[model samples]
Target: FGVKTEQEDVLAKELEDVNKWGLHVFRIAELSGNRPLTVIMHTIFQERDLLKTFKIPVDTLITYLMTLEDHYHADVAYHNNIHAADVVQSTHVLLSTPALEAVFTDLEILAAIFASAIHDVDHPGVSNQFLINTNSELALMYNDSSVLENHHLAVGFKLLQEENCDIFQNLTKKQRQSLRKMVIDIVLATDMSKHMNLLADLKTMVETKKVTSSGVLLLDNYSDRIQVLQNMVHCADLSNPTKPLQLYRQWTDRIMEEFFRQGDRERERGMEISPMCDKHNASVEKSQVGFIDYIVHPLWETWADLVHPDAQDILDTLEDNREWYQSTIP
Candidate 1:
């Protein structure tokens, strides 16, 4: 309690601009050290008055968050706690959009933020398909259906079972059920296999363009709200391209390294090498271009439409980076 006095002060200063677009998550990680996940999320909860509103046990919540962060392997190049923190920051940015100002309740805001924190928790350094292909225990345990995602959800709840870490213990039975359902739904939606379905829901929403009598975003049902929030987290998950070029390239290198390592493991075991995983055959620039064109650009474009001018800059930056990669590709 007494030791983190200086840390709490620094975190308070840094997180002032954390809600803005283009917030640098790497910098936050450097400053927040081992508790970046808890730091960012604790701030969000405080800002939303959820700690007070829900009567959360602060010490227990911190214990749970640190334990959750421990579960994410630091050796993993990409899906570590820093990436989770990045997604949390990005989710905060998405929620800050003027169009979505009052569209979500405190309950949903809590769920979305929490889901982003644990969506990739305990991710092995490889993709779900890699686990399935190798007949990994995780794949077997989850029965090959969103294997990694299922594992993450399971591990997260398993940690909450600890006596000093069950922050939700005080919530009503109905509240607990709602939070659990939303978190599970959001985490599973992050599975790449569900990408098309998530995008379609977003596309349909953009095409329809619903607004209330006062021009606020109108999401009347759980289906609509969850779809938007799922896409929100998905966009945040895939937001590397929309970042500044240097940070974007840093992310590129990390993911590529992780992919190439997987390729090395596959070659060692005589399995077929996955696309973009082969270091010798990799066309980094070309792959970046295709990813942005087919996945990043389309999603950000629709998101920009949903939030109008709010996300146009992100979309524009993405195209700018796409053009850069197009020019650089051999």
Candidate 2:
């Protein structure tokens, strides 16, 4: 909304296409002058009618989103607002899958979207390990356990305390409590250390998943529902490889830039570089291939299995992306 008239027209046209899986948020970021997270988050809230349903004031919603976007480090190569916008869009696409359609309540959907927007707020472009190794204040504050994830959650909730930025101000106390718990759980699950445990839980859920006669997943309890949502956000976080090859490559470039920057810092301090962070020695292609094989594939495969044909194309793209990276290894 801060864009010039011409740019606003361009962003409006781009946002119209955002509901599709292949929507390129990089263009949205460029057109919005690096404010894609705010614009995209606003559009989705409106699309879902959360504003009307929850009685959230439009101006207050915009204020909240804009303020949240400001917290996302613009200088960070991968964890900037652009990445947050990408994840928000990706999470929307995942939540809209056929099997999940109408399965989650409006409250659950709100938490998913809001959590995605704030999941990496204030990221320092370094890993949790780096903070712990250096005894960074954040590490000490979080007790070396999910340091960045905890910080992201705290920063996200803190922004709401600002005047005119509390989008949930209209929610009932119980509703607010539910939303906060779900958001915290979803954001914390973004920590890579939680990936395996989350994936394992998802795999078990898929194996024993209950479906209605119409084939929609039957998540009858809060535990079952939140578990699915946790994986949904995690899937969105890892969704880059499942996107179009060009977009996936762009994400790879940004992430490698962030990783190499970390490596540079570690090298400067005479600390051993983290995996795939050393620019001189790291084979980007090989690392991505291994990432697909060992991490992205396993998690997405279980996810696709859980959703069946609804996510088949996404899995197909992941395979194609893996092959593209593999072919570059020569």
Candidate 3:
């Protein structure tokens, strides 16, 4: 534990083996006489349960496919369980803020976490448009309302129908309806096309905000309040390019790689590549700056003011990451 590795290559070699990697942390934790092993394993199970809903009956070979998720991991830096935990953590940070303080009940908080946990489960590493362009079975199965959204919602619900995967089984029918509405609204809002309306509503509220002494937003309706939380999650989702140097670089690498892969597939099928996914002339830094400045930043900037201190650091991280990309331009 006292030792250090100089280069990333060394670190990569050290962690190349999955079992070795998990055991490495575990062995050290055991030796320290305070093993968090079970905790980590349990956490893995919860995350993996998100996968079990697809009903593929996960086998050892299935893990490689999960790793494929690492490709899309770029745009949502906090993707996978690691990223899910980060968003849930970020969500808690947002909820604890005085601006939102005590306005929501424990049930709402639970709903937020549950929603975030499976927010992007089984992402196909491509956008809804691509499925349509390729005449994919997902497109056919869903008959385009588009299947990406339809399928994602359907699959997420299907996962819940599984016996052990029923985390919401105890919820009343009314509660289930409430949760379902919230999840669908938030998840569908994630489509980049809806970015503008989401931010406009958020900014309008911030401009005309009414708050209590504790700074809790004086939101009246269940739908209105949950709408705010919905934006918060979306803001966090698009906050990747604006993160720190190392994290930003990590995202850029993953995203461009994902994009490149999609581009490669398009080339094979003689289809036009979608924006950012086309890797031929893709400048990771350039596209990142463009995405952040145009798509990502505009959303989060309004979000930060909506929640203030809770989002300030995230805002800073995003801006700084943008500046880092700028430095590469000249």
Candidate 4:
């Protein structure tokens, strides 16, 4: 809870330094201690003080988090608000990396954090293909390829239109435009269809990234660098593999249940069940391991390579999680 500029003006004209409204945030989330979120947060938060030192108006930041909670309960699952908080904190850590030193300005950092928090808002508990094949409206609206991602981006920004939650209002016209484009691109890029492109780009950057004299990446091109940050958040979004076995198992359970529910709906409607959705045909454990090996690992390996110690433990956790699943599955 905080006060915005309009609210502040109700008082007698007083000395106003916008820094007085500054806010920085974190939470004691167990999820953050794990893979993509954990390692990335380690890097982003190293310079948390740099963000706070300027003391930007925190009311919008606070409003976004608060609004996210209500939105999650109404629209998503247990994973919603808590997950957003975790990712926001994690993005903070990713931005703190020595590699990012002097590379990103304040708006870039804001864009990253904003993109992370709202990336998955209003998820409809189904995959892109399910929405597409069913001709679900979201699929039609997005033209099929990225139904869920498109919806999330639209609703998240719409939330910004709320009075208390208008965090970007203070930013200048050009700044706001840049911030919006960066965040929208990052959020929409989370679609699983785009996963390969994002990962490929990250790998190339890791292989041939230019560095500054002090070891920070010199990313003068906004599009090139924001692409890296986009992949970072998407990697964190799918980072269940890099968690403790027990914890990873839980995430797998939730997403699988979500998938199965979609399958159930398809079955009732006499439509074909997507491979992972058909509960009976679903080898829950097998499909999960396949996703890990095929999709999750290769992307994370590239990210882990970019920042070794920060992500080493997470890489270990993913291995442990995979092995634990294998040990128990027939």
lDDT of 3 by residue, 1-330 (tens): 566545433433433322211123323223323222222332333443433432333332133223322222334322334444344444544555667777876556556655554566556676677888878888888776546656656655666544444555556788778778877776777666777888888888889888787676788887678778788777656655655566557556766776777778888888888787776767777887888888788887787777776667767777877888888984
Once superposed on the true structure, which residue ranges of model 1 sit more than 4 Å away at CA?
Answer: 1-11
| Best candidate (score: lDDT) | 2
> lDDT, candidate 2, residue 312?
90
User: What would you estimate as the lDDT of candidate 2?
Assistant: 0.93
lDDT of 4 by residue, 1-330 (tens): 465455234221221211111111111232222122322233343335423533434665555556654565333433455566555655655665555666777777778877887777777777787778888888888888577777877888898788677756666789888888998889888877788888888888888877668666666787787887787788767776775565565567777877888889999999888878898888888887888889988887888877654567667777777776677678
Task: Give all TM-scores, in the order shown.
Answer: 0.95, 0.98, 0.74, 0.79
**Model 2 over residues 36-111: C-alpha lDDT tens digits?**
9989988898898989999999999989899999999988999999999999999998988889878998999999
What overall lDDT, based on C-alpha atoms, would model 1 receive against the true structure?
0.87
Scored against the true structure, residue 110 in model 2 reaches a CA lDDT of 93
Best by TM-score: 2
Give the distance in Å from residue 222's predicted Cα in candidate 1 to where it truly belongs. Answer: 1.3
Error of 1 at 161 (Å): 1.0
Collision count of model 3: 3
Candidate 1 RMSD to the correct structure: 1.7
Clashing pairs in 1: none
